[PDB]
């Protein structure tokens, strides 16, 4: 019981409990998915409603023209990382005058989220992320964690009950490469419904998406622009 | 930072009274008994000495009676260690006043300047408070003679006759009965302080080594701080001892 | 750059010209020197155009913060002090601004002159700018506190008209702002050259 | 940097069909003296880009050291990304500018050549941060001498081959040897193509002095 | 340059100053009052650079008013003089030098009347009479000749009118109107403004 | 010692019509008497409706443009919308002013369409003052351009002549001809011309040939 | 330095340090006040007088400025600080705004200090409840109360410190419009208010009054005794 | 009872537990090995695939600290990416200060000191990352240095870090690697790993290898396609 | 007490933030409502004694001319945000020369919600999260807008909200009576009808306060003379 309260205290098993508890913060929030073809990379985030009267949180944030993120975790805590990511992408266009490589941008997050896990008296950022981007090496989908360990992934799902959405992405993995703009998005939309119970369906209000690709900059479709993709998909 | 090792010295109690301040007053409760009496002419400080041995040198000064300024002095009841930190601060405060305003510091201004230092340590910083409660004497161009008693919490006030340290409660009850407002003189004040101590001394016979008296008078526009030598102190005792029978 | 203000029975009148030039070449023509701050507060422009324009916007910002916090609708006297205190911490760094703050507070038709170095002066009559000297002559020509409204504007026109005529760095159109208890109101914006051949008959 | 110790000299470059060639003297010059007569003023940056500079040489080895770490640190990740000569150019433009705004500038003038994605990049920066891109470049007095020699060809023949390029570079280096005081005969011709940066050895110019008899 | 003056009588301190506020070749404000009241019986007179006078002398007026509220009694004219010095002195070597010229005039229940001179280098001097500005050269000579420690306030104002009317003859700047105030056991008292309707 | 600023020349001309705003500049980048390159567009694009010119030291024109385009994204990410033409002016007024002690040497002329759909030109100074006007100029040829516009655009100094709002068809030939007149008599202007026309439909860039000498 | 959270939340949402700070006020020296027409009166009871004390240095009714006075009930060591911090703001206000200080303006600044010291790292909440009184421009009396938490209100009549509950029980009944018509009955209302906290005593009662532009005036034990002589 | 709560406390027996606990973070990490030969140094790593969703090559455990220095980590990969980035700062500070290739013996010191500075205080936690550093030089030869959470550096002919050690450290002793050539070592490295790797808890992995030595002219590289395929097939043929 | 301010509970939520929301339940009921024609704001004053002056208690503050506000929970902590929100609105008007939208105001105050922390901080950092929940009503080019803020730093757009002592009792009856296009005057009545029942003391002109804002009219608070006619129509 004494090993729990501090970040810098190990255990007899070599497990840091606070970093484990910070992983629970990701499971406490809405599920998000994303995947990439040979060209496009699309994030699909489920905007959760506090009530039917109140509106929905924004789970997708712009970073740079070619880069976008889907935040799952503490909402105001993700705006600390998003503000860091926007400054790194501006400093890349201000200095090198080139779009920042996505594999570099995720490495800077691994350096920023590593420090609070190392030092006493601080907490690890409780936000998981999916960074979708496009660069000279092709589209990328990167998962991060509170533990600061970042991955390189074809498709992932984070958030509450994300394991089921991950299972769906594995079966269709072979088809993800040749999908066009429309069909690619439909793969992610079919993943979200698996996370939520059948008593709730997908609507124009509670689902937001973003798309980055070869000739297309990262753009967020809010509500009315989500409907044309929602239509044509059987539930 | 390891809070586990932090004792939280600045937090309130459930009844709203700071612990480290109350425990500091019990440290002062067993320290040397000091008292003071304000008369028509002059103010005195009678300090009891709790360190006495044949091997002690008595090299410096009154030993627990200090001098803050040309016009002011102080006694000390509490931890002997922490008193040397305050005294070095009071001597800086009076000299910073004299630096700007080029006049002696009034007693009200110096006391409330130190109690701000006793607040910073009780309010914040996490460091322990001071275990030293002080008496003050002095004269200023405005309110005349002054006698002030602070505490480890920084709560001071004016007093005609007061006491501090061991058996400070039993002494004040004696002053309230004997002390007369405006009717006290330095000759009648010295005879009063001895009668008060002789009852509150844990060691009888009132040796000239234990109790030492420091008086403050103003003469020829100059404040005179004198510590009565053991010769004159014993003379006042013998004059008080003959008045008990004869 | 010519600017003037004066107060009387029915309140303050502010008059400026429009020209601001750099060197021998005139940069712009119709530039508006008078700065609006509150409904009932009115500032002016003198010296470096960007300096007084910037710092007067902070005064417009601070007057708003005062009115939101206290709700007491800041008096002209205090608003003049805020603009001076902001210019006093940058002293020595080369900020050049003149200014005047006009308005109607509970006390009366207050008028002030705030300078680059912190000079703060209330008073009845003021003028600033390079052609300021040419303004005092026509304004002191028998201006009196007993003038009516129409008689007062005729002095405001005729002051700047003769001020910019003698000064090569002053000219353009005359902007005249009357002051009342409720707030300032723009009387006119009129070309100097057209008023010259009027007064010249 | 008010009086940089050991200045360089003019640096010629001109983009030809499928490649870029950069010529620079091998002479370091301290004041009016020719002191260090063998130096490489043209640095190889990664595979596809080529740098050479003018002005203070002590500031060139500092940038040689920094850009060395920039490219080496980039190779250490192995992500497949390599700085394009436009990034090396836009990075120097900031380094030159940020040193400027602090009133502690690096006195230098640089010419970045490179060939990437079938697009030849020849580029120019400056001490003050002035930066641009041109089909032909020169620094110092090369801009007053070999620059109208390069432009006079490019106006008539905008498309130059690799053989015609070096011939025109040898002629322009020959004119600098004649008409520039701080120039020197031995120079390097470094030509970057799709095959990679290749720095030719020290060369020289055949000079015709026979007009000395005409003047007599 | 602006003009100040002061005179110390046995029971009183009679100070006067010019009301002109001038910029470039014109007089902006002719009624400008340069007499700053530090406390009840304590005045202050500050001339110098246009911005440094009001900026500095207001830092003093608040420290003096603050002292009276803290300890319940106002500063004496002696302590208020040595306080204005140390602030003006500490500025000198810092990055914000003040250029001012001060006169601290006050009355005290015990020390009695007091008048202090100060320059922009913060050198404090206690004199029976003092003056600042270019008008201080044409005046202090007259004060030398008619001043006496036993002077009466009836004579003092008459003596002050002899000095101030000679700035209208030799002294080049206009200075049409002069403010005058007197201090006694009953506090500050205004006197009829000396005015020469040119 | 070290002289931080150099004059690179350049000329900028803006005209605000009813439905249109034109921002044109030459391509010549020259320090001293030498021409570095004959294509160096001064006109830079900010938003779809906003084109900014920069005339002055070229290193500040490149730095200030990257600072503006950085705060366009800082605004677009924070406020979820593009800056209005009036907001770019007010921002760049405070950007230029934060350098007050060590100023940018540049002459910025912002032009485009406002919320009303009407041509709005904002001309600045290196210290950050700004005022709206129908037509402005900048650079070395600014003194030659302004008097020509006071006549044709302003109809000044002509008694009893009708005032017709300037038409884009007249505005195209008016911008081209003042440069044909300026590039002749000015050594810092020529070698090419780039006109960026800002209308409600979009930006249309048109290049014009000028005397090469 | 020492940066650590002292004041923190609790499973019930209560702040312990702020509630324990108010416990220090819950034993004070009882301080009361009422508002009249042109006059306003403050009062405080002192049970600590042994006749050996100097009554002048222990006065808990102070003056922040010419137009504003205040009292407090709580730990007196903390009041010196707030008061010395408030008096700095009064003069810095006259330096910023040539007008005098509004009674409300100085009450905000006293409250903004008691806030910052609640949320700051490694601090302690003040244990004083200050009662501020003054005349705003146009001559309207104003009476305010602060809280160790930083919450300031206004009051027609109020009581703080020990026994403040029983005093309000007398004030709420006997405060009417027919009252506070004359300057004496306004003072006679305060002395009657302290009768609930009277120990069979009241020679220890301290009073203060403010009327129009006149500064604060503290009544001597003789002047108060004349008001006490009239009861039945 | 409280003695193990911080790295600043000794047990009554003298052991520092918070450092011993960080070592158990390596004991649960996957196994990585390294080996020296006459020609150079060879690396190998078992990189476990936690899900098919992960791209091939993700969570790469072989870091390039410098051109001539390779690195292989076993432990928590979050702290490893911090070390690899800090080890690059030391190699770049060396390149800046002394202007040549950092000797591996010195690079395994500065890094093992930084790992050590976090076992002293109570305001930080020990690294859970154990890693080895191989390098080759013509004037030095094959060098291999292991660093552990405590900051201890030893040279090795071959070593095993992570879960399986005593099993892998016995299999390396049987073969004599001193006179062998790197091209024949690569085939033996993969042979050892597949013998060491047993599938009970985990499922699948991706074999990673590295060249540094005479073949590569001193530049540390991953094994090229054909050779990696040539080496992996031999370990499968030798499996039975 | 054994558990820093930044410690995560095993459930994945910060303690101090979990406890801060527990402090909102002790505040005063504040009911915002949004309408296409404007925003209405009502809050209970909670007068604790007859001697208290109701005019001095203002729980509805004006952040800017186009933006109102409301507060519940600790009133002391609200002043830090309100004085910060007013600066950010004027910073925007000063820099970009336009009225800051209600969206950017919340992003300004919501950034300060998680700034609390102990180590690696400045002297201006906070040891605890705010115990106040704010409701920003306002009108911009996007129309009337109403937002909600909690101590966790999450700003949420809303058509209407209820905060303070009883959120549940008010939110239950509020979602019902709020329908679409319903205008201001209808919203004010529905706001008081909900508010009158959820409080304890009876509805009076001085007992509670009311505010509103319109697209063509600046933020306005109804005086006692105007409220006496409104409470007459209850």
Curated annotation (Swiss-Prot), chain B:
Name under which the protein is recorded: Proteasome subunit alpha type-4
Keyword Acetylation attributed: yes
Biological processes per GO annotation: proteasome-mediated ubiquitin-dependent protein catabolic process
InterPro entries, A to Z: Ntn_hydrolases_N, Proteasome_alpha, Proteasome_alpha-type, Proteasome_asu_N, Proteasome_bsu_CS, Proteasome_sua/b
Its job: Component of the 20S core proteasome complex involved in the proteolytic degradation of most intracellular proteins. This complex plays numerous essential roles within the cell by associating with different regulatory particles. Associated with two 19S regulatory particles, forms the 26S proteasome and thus participates in the ATP-dependent degradation of ubiquitinated proteins.
Species of origin: Bos taurus
GO cellular component: cytosol; nucleus; P-body; proteasome core complex; proteasome core complex, alpha-subunit complex
Modified residue annotations for Phosphoserine: 13, 75, 173
UniProt record similarity statement: Belongs to the peptidase T1A family.
Gene: PSMA4
Keywords noted in UniProt: Acetylation, Cytoplasm, Nucleus, Phosphoprotein, Proteasome
Compartments, as annotated in UniProt: Cytoplasm; Nucleus
Nucleus among keywords: yes
Residue positions, PTM N6-acetyllysine: 127, 176
Stored CDD domains: proteasome_alpha_type_4
Primary localization class, coarse: cytoplasm
A Pfam family it matches: Proteasome
Curated annotation (Swiss-Prot), chain F:
GO biological process entries: proteolysis involved in protein catabolic process
Chain segments annotated as coiled-coil in the UniProt record: none
InterPro entries: Ntn_hydrolases_N, Proteasome_bsu_CS, Proteasome_sua/b, Proteasome_suB-type
Keyword Glycosyltransferase belongs to the record: no
Positions where N6-acetyllysine occurs in the chain: 176
Keywords tagged on the record: Acetylation, Cytoplasm, Glycoprotein, Nucleus, Phosphoprotein, Proteasome
Record-linked Gene3D superfamilies: Glutamine Phosphoribosylpyrophosphate, subunit 1, domain 1 (3.60.20.10)
PANTHER family: METALLOPROTEASE TLDD, PROTEASOME SUBUNIT BETA TYPE-1
Function: Non-catalytic component of the 20S core proteasome complex involved in the proteolytic degradation of most intracellular proteins. This complex plays numerous essential roles within the cell by associating with different regulatory particles. Associated with two 19S regulatory particles, forms the 26S proteasome and thus participates in the ATP-dependent degradation of ubiquitinated proteins.
Oligomeric and partner information: The 26S proteasome consists of a 20S proteasome core and two 19S regulatory subunits. The 20S proteasome core is a barrel-shaped complex made of 28 subunits that are arranged in four stacked rings. The two outer rings are each formed by seven alpha subunits, and the two inner rings are formed by seven beta subunits. The proteolytic activity is exerted by three beta-subunits PSMB5, PSMB6 and PSMB7. Interacts with SERPINB2. Interacts with RFPL4A.
Family: Belongs to the peptidase T1B family.
Record protein name field: Proteasome subunit beta type-1
Swiss-Prot record, chain G:
Residue positions, PTM N6-acetyllysine: 226
PROSITE patterns: PROTEASOME_ALPHA_1, PROTEASOME_ALPHA_2
Presence of the UniProt keyword Nucleotidyltransferase in the record: no
Domain of life, per lineage: Eukaryota
Subcellular location: Cytoplasm; Nucleus
GO terms for biological process, alphabetical: proteasome-mediated ubiquitin-dependent protein catabolic process
Modified residues (Phosphotyrosine): 152
Keywords: Acetylation, Cytoplasm, Glycoprotein, Nucleus, Phosphoprotein, Proteasome
Purpose of the protein: Component of the 20S core proteasome complex involved in the proteolytic degradation of most intracellular proteins. This complex plays numerous essential roles within the cell by associating with different regulatory particles. Associated with two 19S regulatory particles, forms the 26S proteasome and thus participates in the ATP-dependent degradation of ubiquitinated proteins.
Name this polypeptide is given: Proteasome subunit alpha type-7
Lineage, broadest ranks: Eukaryota, Metazoa, Chordata, Craniata, Vertebrata
UniProtKB/Swiss-Prot annotation, chain H:
In-chain residues carrying the UniProt-annotated modification N6-acetyllysine: 52, 201, 225
GO terms under biological process: proteasome-mediated ubiquitin-dependent protein catabolic process
Modified residues (Phosphoserine): 238
Keyword Phosphoprotein listed: yes
Localization in the cell: Cytoplasm; Nucleus
Cellular component GO terms held in the UniProt record: cytosol; nucleus; proteasome core complex; proteasome core complex, alpha-subunit complex
Keyword annotations of the record: Acetylation, Cytoplasm, Nucleus, Phosphoprotein, Proteasome
Keyword Electron transport: no
Matching InterPro entries: Ntn_hydrolases_N, Proteasome_alpha, Proteasome_alpha-type, Proteasome_asu_N, Proteasome_sua/b
Subunit and partners: The 26S proteasome consists of a 20S proteasome core and two 19S regulatory subunits. The 20S proteasome core is a barrel-shaped complex made of 28 subunits that are arranged in four stacked rings. The two outer rings are each formed by seven alpha subunits, and the two inner rings are formed by seven beta subunits. The proteolytic activity is exerted by three beta-subunits PSMB5, PSMB6 and PSMB7. Interacts with AURKB. Interacts with CDKN1A. Interacts with MDM2 and RB1. Interacts with the C-terminus of TBXA2R isoform 2. Interacts with DNAJB2.
Family, per entry: Belongs to the peptidase T1A family.
Protein name: Proteasome subunit alpha type-3
Annotated organism of origin: Bos taurus
Lineage of producing organism: Eukaryota, Metazoa, Chordata, Craniata, Vertebrata
């Amino acid at each position: 019981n004494q090993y729990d309260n501090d970040v810098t205290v190990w255990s007899p098993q070599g497990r840091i409990h606070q970093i484990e508890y910070a992983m629970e913060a990701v499971k406490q929030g809405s599920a998000t998915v994303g995947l990439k073809s040979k060209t496009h990379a699309v994030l699909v985030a489920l905007k959760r409603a506090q009530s039917e009267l109140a509106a929905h949180q924004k789970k997708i944030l712009h970073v740079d023209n070619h880069i976008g993120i889907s935040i799952a975790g503490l909402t105001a805590d993700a705006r600390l990382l998003c503000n860091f990511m926007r400054q790194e992408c501006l400093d890349s266009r201000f200095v090198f005058d080139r779009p920042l490589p996505v594999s570099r941008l995720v490495s800077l997050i691994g350096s920023k989220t590593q420090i609070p896990t190392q030092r006493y008296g601080r907490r690890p950022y409780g936000v998981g992320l999916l960074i979708a981007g496009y660069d000279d090496m092709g589209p990328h989908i990167f998962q991060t964690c509170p533990s600061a360990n970042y991955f390189d992934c074809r498709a992932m799902s984070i958030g509450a009950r994300s394991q089921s959405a991950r299972t769906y992405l594995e079966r269709h993995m072979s088809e993800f490469m040749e999908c066009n703009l429309n069909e690619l998005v439909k793969h992610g939309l079919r993943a979200l419904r698996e996370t939520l119970p059948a008593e709730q369906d997908l609507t124009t209000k509670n689902v937001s998406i973003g798309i980055v690709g070869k000739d297309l900059e990262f753009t967020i479709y809010d509500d009315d622009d989500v409907s044309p993709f929602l239509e044509g998909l059987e539930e | 930072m390891s809070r586990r090792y932090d004792s939280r010295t600045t937090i309130f109690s459930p009844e709203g009274r700071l612990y480290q301040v109350e425990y500091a007053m019990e440290a002062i409760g067993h320290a040397g008994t000091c008292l003071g009496i304000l008369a028509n002419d002059g103010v005195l400080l009678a300090a009891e000495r709790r360190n006495i041995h044949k091997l002690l040198d008595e090299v410096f000064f009154s030993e627990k009676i200090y001098k803050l300024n040309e016009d002011m002095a102080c006694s000390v009841a509490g931890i002997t260690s922490d008193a040397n930190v305050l005294t070095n601060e009071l001597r800086l405060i009076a000299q910073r006043y004299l630096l700007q305003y080029q006049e002696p510091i009034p007693c009200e201004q110096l006391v409330t300047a130190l109690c701000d230092i006793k607040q910073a340590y009780t309010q914040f910083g996490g460091k322990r408070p001071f275990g030293v409660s002080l008496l003050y004497i002095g004269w200023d161009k405005h309110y005349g003679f002054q006698l002030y008693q602070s505490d480890p919490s920084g709560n001071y006030g004016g007093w005609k006759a007061t006491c501090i340290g061991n058996n400070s409660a039993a002494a004040v009850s004696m002053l309230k009965q004997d002390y007369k407002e405006g009717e006290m003189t330095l000759k009648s004040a010295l005879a009063l302080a001895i009668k008060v101590l002789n009852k509150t001394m844990d060691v009888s016979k009132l040796s000239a080594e234990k109790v030492e008296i420091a008086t403050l008078t103003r003469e020829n526009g100059k404040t005179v701080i004198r510590v009565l030598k053991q010769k004159e102190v014993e003379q006042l005792i013998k004059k008080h001892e003959e008045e008990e029978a004869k | 750059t010519t600017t003037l203000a004066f107060k009387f029975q029915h309140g303050v009148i502010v008059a400026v010209d429009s020209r601001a030039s750099a060197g021998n070449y005139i940069a712009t023509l119709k530039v508006n020197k008078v700065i609006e701050i509150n409904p009932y507060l009115l500032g002016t422009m003198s010296g470096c155009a960007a300096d007084c324009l910037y710092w007067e916007r902070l005064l417009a910002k601070e007057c708003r913060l005062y009115y939101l916090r206290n709700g007491e609708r800041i008096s002209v006297s205090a608003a003049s002090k805020l603009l001076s205190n902001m210019m006093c911490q940058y002293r020595g760094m080369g900020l050049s601004m003149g200014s005047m703050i006009c308005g109607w507070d509970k006390k009366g038709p207050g008028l002030y002159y705030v300078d680059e170095n912190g000079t703060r002066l209330s008073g009845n009559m003021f003028s600033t700018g390079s052609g300021n000297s040419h303004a005092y002559g026509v304004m002191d020509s028998g201006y009196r506190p007993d003038l009516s409204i129409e008689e007062a504007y005729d002095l405001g026109r005729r002051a700047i008209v003769h001020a910019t005529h003698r000064d090569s760095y002053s000219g353009g159109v005359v902007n005249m702002y009357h002051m009342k208890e409720d707030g300032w109101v723009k009387v006119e914006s009129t070309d100097v050259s057209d008023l010259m051949h009027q007064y010249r008959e | 940097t008010q009086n940089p110790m050991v200045t360089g000299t003019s640096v010629l470059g001109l983009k030809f069909e499928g490649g870029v060639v950069i010529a620079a003297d091998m002479l370091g010059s301290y004041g009016s003296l020719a002191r260090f007569r063998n130096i490489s003023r043209i640095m190889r940056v990664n595979n596809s880009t080529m740098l050479g500079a003018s002005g203070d040489y002590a500031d060139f080895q500092y940038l040689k050291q920094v850009l060395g770490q920039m490219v080496i640190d980039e190779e250490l990740l192995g992500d497949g990304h390599s700085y394009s000569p436009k990034a090396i150019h836009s990075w120097l433009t900031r380094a030159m500018y940020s040193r400027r705004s602090k009133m502690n500038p690096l006195w230098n003038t640089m010419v970045i050549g490179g060939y990437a994605d079938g697009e030849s990049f020849l580029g120019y920066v400056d001490m003050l941060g002035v930066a641009y891109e041109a089909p032909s470049l020169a620094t110092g007095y090369g801009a007053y001498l070999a620059q109208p020699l390069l432009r006079e060809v490019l106006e008539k023949q905008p498309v130059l081959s690799q053989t015609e390029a070096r011939e025109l570079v040898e002629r322009c280096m020959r004119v600098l040897y004649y008409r520039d005081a701080r120039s020197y005969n031995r120079f390097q011709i470094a030509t970057v193509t799709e095959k990679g940066v290749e720095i030719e050895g020290p060369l020289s110019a055949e000079t015709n002095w026979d007009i000395a008899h005409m003047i007599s | 340059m602006e003009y100040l003056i002061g005179i110390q009588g046995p029971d009183y301190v009679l100070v006067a100053s010019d009301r002109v506020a001038a910029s470039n070749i014109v007089q902006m404000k002719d009624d400008h009052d340069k007499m700053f009241k530090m406390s009840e019986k304590i005045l202050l007179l500050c001339v110098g650079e246009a911005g440094d006078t009001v900026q500095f002398a207001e830092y003093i007026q608040k420290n003096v008013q603050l002292y009276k509220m803290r300890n319940g009694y106002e500063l004496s004219p002696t302590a208020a003089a040595n306080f204005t010095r140390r602030n003006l002195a500490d500025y000198l070597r810092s990055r914000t030098p003040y250029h001012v010229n001060l006169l601290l005039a006050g009355y005290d229940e015990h020390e009695g009347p007091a008048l202090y001179y100060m320059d922009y280098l913060a050198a404090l001097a206690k004199a029976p009479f003092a003056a600042h500005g270019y008008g201080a050269f044409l005046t202090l000579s007259i004060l030398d000749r008619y001043y006496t420690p036993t002077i009466s306030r009836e004579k003092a104002v008459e003596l002050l009118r002899k000095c101030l009317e000679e700035l209208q003859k030799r002294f080049i700047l206009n200075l049409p109107t002069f403010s005058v105030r007197i201090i006694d056991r009953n506090g500050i008292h205004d006197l009829d403004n000396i005015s020469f309707p040119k | 010692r070290f002289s931080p600023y150099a004059f690179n020349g350049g000329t900028v001309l803006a005209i605000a019509g009813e439905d249109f705003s034109i921002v044109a500049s030459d391509t010549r980048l020259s320090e001293g008497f030498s021409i570095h390159t004959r294509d160096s567009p001064k006109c830079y694009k900010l938003t779809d409706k906003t084109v900014i010119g920069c005339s002055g030291f070229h290193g500040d024109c490149l730095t200030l443009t990257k600072i503006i385009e950085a705060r366009l994204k800082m605004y677009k990410h924070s406020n979820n919308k593009a800056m209005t033409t009036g907001a770019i002016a007010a921002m760049l007024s405070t950007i230029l002013y934060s350098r007050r002690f060590f100023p940018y040497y540049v002459y910025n002329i912002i032009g485009g369409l406002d919320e009303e759909g009407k041509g709005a030109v904002y001309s600045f100074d290196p210290v950050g003052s700004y005022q709206r006007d129908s037509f402005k100029a900048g650079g070395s040829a600014s003194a030659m351009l302004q008097p020509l516009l006071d006549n044709q655009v302003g109809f000044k100094n002509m008694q009893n002549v009708e005032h017709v709002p300037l038409s884009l068809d007249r505005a195209m030939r008016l911008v081209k001809d003042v440069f044909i007149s300026a590039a002749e008599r000015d050594v810092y202007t020529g070698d090419a011309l780039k006109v960026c026309i800002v209308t409600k439909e979009g930006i249309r860039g048109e290049t014009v040939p000028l005397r090469k000498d | 330095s020492y940066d650590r959270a002292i004041t923190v939340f609790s499973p019930d949402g209560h702040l312990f340090q702020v509630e324990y700070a108010q416990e220090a006020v819950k034993k004070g020296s009882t301080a009361v006040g009422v508002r009249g027409k042109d006059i306003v009166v403050l009062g405080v009871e002192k049970k600590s007088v042994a006749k050996l004390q100097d009554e002048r240095t222990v006065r808990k009714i102070c003056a922040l400025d010419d137009n504003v006075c205040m009292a407090f009930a709580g730990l007196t060591a903390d009041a010196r600080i707030v008061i010395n911090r408030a008096r700095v703001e009064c003069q810095s206000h006259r330096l910023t705004v040539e007008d005098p200080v509004t009674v409300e303006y100085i009450t905000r600044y006293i409250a903004s200090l008691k806030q910052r010291y609640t949320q700051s790292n490694g601090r302690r909440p003040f244990g004083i409840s200050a009662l501020i009184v003054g005349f705003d421009f146009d001559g309207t009396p104003r009476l305010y109360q602060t809280d160790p938490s930083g919450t300031y209100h206004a009051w027609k009549a109020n009581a703080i410190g020990r026994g403040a509950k029983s005093v309000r029980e007398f004030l709420e009944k006997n405060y009417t419009d027919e009252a506070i018509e004359t300057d004496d009955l306004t003072i006679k209302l305060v002395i009657k208010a302290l009768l609930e906290v009277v120990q069979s005593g009241g020679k220890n009662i301290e009073l203060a009054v403010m009327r129009r532009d006149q500064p604060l005036k503290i009544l001597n034990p003789e002047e108060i005794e004349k008001y006490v002589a009239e009861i039945e | 009872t409280g003695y193990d709560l911080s790295a600043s406390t000794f047990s009554p027996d003298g052991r520092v537990f918070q450092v011993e606990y960080a070592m158990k973070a390596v004991e649960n990490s996957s196994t990585a090995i390294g080996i020296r030969c006459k020609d150079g140094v060879v690396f190998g790593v078992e990189k476990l695939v936690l899900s098919k969703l992960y791209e091939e090559g993700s969570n790469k455990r072989l870091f390039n600290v410098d051109r001539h220095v390779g690195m292989a980590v076993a432990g928590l990969l979050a702290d490893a990416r911090s070390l690899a980035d800090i080890a690059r700062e030391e190699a770049s500070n060396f390149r800046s200060n002394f202007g040549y290739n950092i000797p591996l013996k010195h690079l395994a010191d500065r890094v093992a000191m930084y790992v050590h500075a976090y076992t002293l205080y109570s305001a930080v936690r020990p690294f859970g990352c154990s890693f080895m550093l191989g390098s080759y030089s013509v004037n030095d030869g094959a060098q291999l240095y292991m660093i552990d959470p405590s900051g201890v550096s030893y040279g090795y002919w071959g070593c095993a870090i992570g879960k399986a050690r005593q099993a892998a450290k016995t299999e390396i002793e049987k073969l004599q690697m001193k006179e062998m050539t790197c091209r024949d070592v690569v085939k033996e490295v993969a042979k050892i790993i597949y013998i060491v790797h047993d599938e009970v808890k985990d499922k699948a992995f991706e074999l990673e290898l590295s060249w540094v030595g005479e073949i590569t002219n001193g530049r540390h590289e991953i094994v090229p396609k054909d050779v990696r395929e040539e080496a992996e097939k031999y370990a499968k043929e030798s499996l039975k | 007490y054994d558990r820093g301010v930044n410690t995560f509970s095993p459930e994945g939520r910060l303690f101090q933030v979990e406890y801060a929301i527990e402090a909102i339940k002790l505040g005063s009921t504040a009911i915002g409502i949004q309408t296409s024609e404007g925003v209405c704001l009502a809050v209970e004053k909670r007068i604790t004694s007859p001697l208290m002056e109701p005019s001095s208690i203002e729980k509805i503050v004006e952040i800017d001319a186009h933006i109102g506000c409301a507060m519940s929970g600790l009133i002391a902590d609200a002043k830090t945000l309100i004085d910060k929100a007013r600066v950010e609105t004027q910073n925007h008007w000063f820099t970009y020369n336009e009225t800051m939208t209600v969206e950017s105001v919340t992003q300004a105050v919501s950034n300060l919600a998680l700034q609390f922390g102990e180590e690696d901080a400045d002297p201006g950092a906070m040891s605890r999260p705010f115990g106040v929940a704010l409701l920003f009503g306002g009108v911009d080019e996007k129309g009337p807008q109403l937002f909600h803020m909690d101590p966790s730093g999450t700003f949420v757009q809303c058509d209407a909200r209820a905060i303070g002592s009883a959120s549940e009792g008010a939110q239950s009856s509020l979602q019902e009576v709020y329908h679409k296009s319903m205008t201001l005057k209808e919203a004010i009545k529905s706001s008081l009808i909900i508010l009158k029942q959820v409080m304890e003391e009876k509805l009076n002109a001085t007992n509670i306060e009311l505010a509103t804002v319109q697209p063509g009219q600046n933020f306005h608070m109804f005086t006692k003379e105007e409220l006496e006619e409104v409470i007459k129509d209850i």
